[PDB]
Amino acid sequence: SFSGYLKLTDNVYIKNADIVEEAKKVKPTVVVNAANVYLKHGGGVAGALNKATNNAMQVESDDYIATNGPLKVGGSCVLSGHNLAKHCLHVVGPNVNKGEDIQLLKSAYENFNQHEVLLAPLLSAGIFGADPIHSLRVCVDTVRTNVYLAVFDKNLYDKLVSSF
Numbered sequence: 609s610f611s612g613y614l615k616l617t618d619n620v621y622i623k624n625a626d627i628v629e630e631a632k633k634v635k636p637t638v639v640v641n642a643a644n645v646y647l648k649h650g651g652g653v654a655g656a657l658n659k660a661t662n663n664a665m666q667v668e669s670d671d672y673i674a675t676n677g678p679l680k681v682g683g684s685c686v687l688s689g690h691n692l693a694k695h696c697l698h699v700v701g702p703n704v705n706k707g708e709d710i711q712l713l714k715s716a717y718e719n720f721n722q723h724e725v726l727l728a729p730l731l732s733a734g735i736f737g738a739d740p741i742h743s744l745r746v747c748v749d750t751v752r753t754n755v756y757l758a759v760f761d762k763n764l765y766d767k768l769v770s771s772f
């Protein structure tokens with residue numbers, strides 16, 4: 609199963625790890641992608657997960673968008689996990705760098721509650737511009753299912769743990 613995770617709460621765990629490497633190692637039932645509303649997996653976690661699937665995630669995502677239109681900020685969709693997981697839950701957290709409402713971060717985390725266990729990144733953190741400390745607090749106060757958080761940045765991981 610998941611290994612080397614520090615327990616933060618009854619249901620939230622955290623590890624300093626690259627989510628792609630965690631997914632290849634564990635092959636979880638659900639890997640969360642930090643998606644945008646268009647499912648254009650260019651950078652950050654999205655670009656890295658898509659690259660690990662050899663672009664299969666992007667082709668599937670483009671077919672989903674062509675059929676259904678874009679997601680909402682705070683929304684999600686379940687697609688294939690390809691070689692990384694059974695499923696990929698593409699969750700859209702607000703992108704603060706685009707002036708998207710930070711209160712939608714709680715809505716984005718609520719999508720995790722539809723799944724018993726997930727491997728996930730901190731939503732809206734990194735290139736999305738939100739404060740990762742705030743993202744972890746919203747995560748622990750919103751998610752009731754088992755979430756295994758993979759934080760890529762070591763210095764960020766230490767700050768998140770020491771300030772929790």
Ligand SMILES: CCC(=O)Nc1nc(C)cs1
Binds near residue numbers: 625628652653760
């Ligand atoms: C290039 C690989 C990469 O960006 N990996 C990332 N893992 C996380 C958890 C965020 S970004």
